[PDB]
Structure 1
Amino acid sequence: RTGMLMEGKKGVIIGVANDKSLAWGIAKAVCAQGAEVALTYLSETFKKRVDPLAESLGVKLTVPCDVSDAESVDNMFKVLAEEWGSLDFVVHAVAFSDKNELKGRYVDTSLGNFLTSMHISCYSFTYIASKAEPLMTNGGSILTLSYYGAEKVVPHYNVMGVCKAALEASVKYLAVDLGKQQIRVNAISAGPVRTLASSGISDFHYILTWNKYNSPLRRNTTLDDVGGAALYLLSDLGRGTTGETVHVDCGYHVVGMKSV
């Protein structure tokens, strides 16, 4: 632990499956600042994957949560209510889309993929926000993750661009609903980060390298970058910001053509 920005703040982080993800980068930053964190895992099968990550962060409460199953989500919040009685933050780092449809054209998106992607990548945040609300009695902060594909067309993203635009819109509506209770709702629009030594996807190598060479900072977004932004939005530093999508992308969102 390196500071106290999150000292006394309890929160659940949804989406930590390995030590390479944005969700991990957020968990590490808030734990390093004194937060008390619960991590979710998809099902009994994956508990073994999450335990060591949890142990290494000092997390003592791990809970099953499959965000596509309302009962799973309800149970998870019941556990947090029982263990803690209240909640200060929620981090939603969950997305899903059919990988085979990403390789093709958006216009050929299937209804099943569209609805499943929308459910998991967008609606789940709304449902989670509704369940968090009654536990967040001393205000709080609810955070999700987005990406520039919500705003502009980028490769290998297709229906997720549409889901993330929906998400970013939902953040605004939720902020209004939850703001009277001083609950902030925000998104981080993260630049691409390498999670895999080889994804085997040329578009992903392309996305990463294009961002690296053409972003104002001339590097890729790191987990620590995203951690720092999450610390802003989830601690008291971020009290006056809600409904916002903050770009944590080394500046890429300002580029209209190419670095020269």
Structure 2
Amino acid sequence: MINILKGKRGLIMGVANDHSIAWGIAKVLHSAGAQLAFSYQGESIGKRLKPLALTVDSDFMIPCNVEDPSSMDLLFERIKERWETLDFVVHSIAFSDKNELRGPYYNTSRDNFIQTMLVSCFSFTEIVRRAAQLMPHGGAMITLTYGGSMRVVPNYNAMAPAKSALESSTKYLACDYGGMNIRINAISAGPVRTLAGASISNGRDIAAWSKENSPLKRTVSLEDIGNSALYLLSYLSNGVTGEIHYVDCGYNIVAMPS
């Protein structure tokens, strides 16, 4: 039905388990023809990733700590052992100390702010600038964000400035690389049920509120995000760059409950 990534290959970052946004995206991209490589943040994740990657015809899995520039250098050296070029990158990496994603934003620690900034924001710049070197004929990349970046979500705390910075960087990178025909966009996802509850202390409440008050009366699925990614990483979105694209079932447009 759709094979618009036939012959294409790319890197998926951020798979932790079968409920990860990065995994939902990977399944859709592979279904459209893409060959996939995966980073993984640790062995316990790597163990879950192996059987998943096999279901998308991949055994290309590379350990990487995105807080460490040398680790990211090594990631791309490993990619190049097999692939001279890349067509796309998916960056779906959200991290902060979850114990600080509770209570007022002002209690955010300097150390958590720095680490959250490096992992949730700057790692996209690090990854993009390495990957662009493998795109001599252009390509496309996405990162993931959330509307809590510039409207206030309780407990989201350190993740908010991080995601706002990430959105800003997405636009600057789109401008840096547009002349090379590399497009750079972000998906601003809504909360995904089950994932949300695991990701932050009030996640279940955030997802429930979002479902009850979105125009479509449902939360976004992993498959919806994957399909939006397929759009943003394929020729279908040839006219689109630097876009913060809401895939949140319309939640963002609602001013107050009906």
Pairwise same-fold verdict (TM > 0.5): yes
The answer (yes or no) to whether the contact 2:8–2:87 under 8 Å persists in 1 is yes
2:194 maps to 195
- 1:100 equivalenced with 2:99 (yes/no): yes
- Output aligned runs, 1:95-244, within 5 Å: 95-196=94-195, 199=198, 203-244=202-243
SS at match of 1:83: coil
Residue segments in structure 1 that go unaligned for 5+ positions in a row? none
Q: Deviations 1:36-81 (Å, cap 9, x if unpaired)? A: 1101111345422210110112113111111011111111111222
Q: Percent identity?
A: 52
Cα distance, 1:179–1:198 mapped onto 2, change above 3 Å:
closer
TM-score, normalised relative to structure 1: 0.95
2:25 maps to 26
1:52 maps to 51
Q: Deviations 1:76-118 (Å, cap 9, x if unpaired)? A: 1112222110010001011111111111211111100000000
Matching residue's letter, 1:120? V
After the TM superposition, which parts of structure 1 deviate over 6 Å for at least 4 consecutive aligned residues?
Answer: none
The answer (yes or no) to whether the contact 1:148–1:189 under 8 Å persists in 2 is yes
How far apart, in 2, do the equivalents of 1:237 and 1:114 lie?
37
Cα distance, 1:205–1:240 mapped onto 2, change above 3 Å:
same
The answer (yes or no) to whether the contact 2:212–2:218 under 8 Å persists in 1 is yes
What's the RMSD between the two structures over aligned residues?
1.6
Matching residue's letter, 1:131? R
Cα distance, 1:197–1:159 mapped onto 2, change above 3 Å:
closer
- 1:38 equivalenced with 2:20 (yes/no): no
Residue segments in structure 2 that go unaligned for 5+ positions in a row? none
TM-score, normalised relative to structure 2: 0.96
How far apart, in 1, do the equivalents of 2:59 and 2:106 lie?
45
1:86 maps to 85
The answer (yes or no) to whether the contact 1:14–1:39 under 8 Å persists in 2 is yes
